Amino acid sequence: AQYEDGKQYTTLEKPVAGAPQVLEFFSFFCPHCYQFEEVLHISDNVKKKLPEGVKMTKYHVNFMGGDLGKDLTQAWAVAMALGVEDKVTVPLFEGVQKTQTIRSASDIRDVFINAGIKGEEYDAAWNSFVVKSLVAQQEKAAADVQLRGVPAMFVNGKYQLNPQGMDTSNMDVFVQQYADTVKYLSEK
């Protein structure tokens, strides 16, 4: 087969029922996640190759960065609750990995204030039970596969993308192979 388990993807021993059609996991501490966002635009390119209206979900993980890593999972829940993911993803990546100006929960909050979220609105969201529930959903999704590496993408809770077996000499060909694989898996 042109696509095979062990090469472009692997199959989960215990499939997850009720899973989103496309589920991505990342960490703001994760260097490959940085590239997936800022230089490869993986999520955008996968969306372009999937039918209109397909649900793509993206969750943050706790297992990198200790205390701040957990704070960033809660900040990501705030971003999802307010619908401001596109405004804060790049400044959070750059604050953690480029300028190294994110050292505390207050520094995370500053990124949202700078992106135009009002302080009263961020603080209300941060402390909300809606956001606590979103934190729990992110943790449970990772726990379902005891996820220990990012970036990770799962299709229909059955197939895991395997980018390690993908040619990296050309960044655009890599993105195309990744997206075409997601499309193949979604049609399985």
Curated annotation (Swiss-Prot):
Protein location: Periplasm
Cystine crosslinks: C30-C33
Residue ranges occupied by any Thioredoxin domain in the UniProt entry: 1-131
GO cellular component: outer membrane-bounded periplasmic space
SUPFAM superfamilies: Thioredoxin-like
Keywords, in A-Z order: Disulfide bond, Periplasm, Redox-active center, Signal
Disruption phenotype: Induction of the PhoP/PhoQ two-component regulatory system, suppressed by 50 uM CuSO(4).
GO terms classed as biological process: cellular response to antibiotic
Main localization category: periplasm
GO molecular function, one term: protein-disulfide reductase activity
Function: Required for disulfide bond formation in some periplasmic proteins such as PhoA or OmpA. Acts by transferring its disulfide bond to other proteins and is reduced in the process. DsbA is reoxidized by DsbB. Required for pilus biogenesis. PhoP-regulated transcription is redox-sensitive, being activated when the periplasm becomes more reducing (deletion of dsbA/dsbB, treatment with dithiothreitol). MgrB acts between DsbA/DsbB and PhoP/PhoQ in this pathway.
Family statement: Belongs to the thioredoxin family. DsbA subfamily.
PANTHER family: THIOL:DISULFIDE INTERCHANGE PROTEIN DSBA (PTHR35891:SF2)
Name of the molecule in the record: Thiol:disulfide interchange protein DsbA
UniProt source species: Escherichia coli (strain K12)
Gene field: dsbA
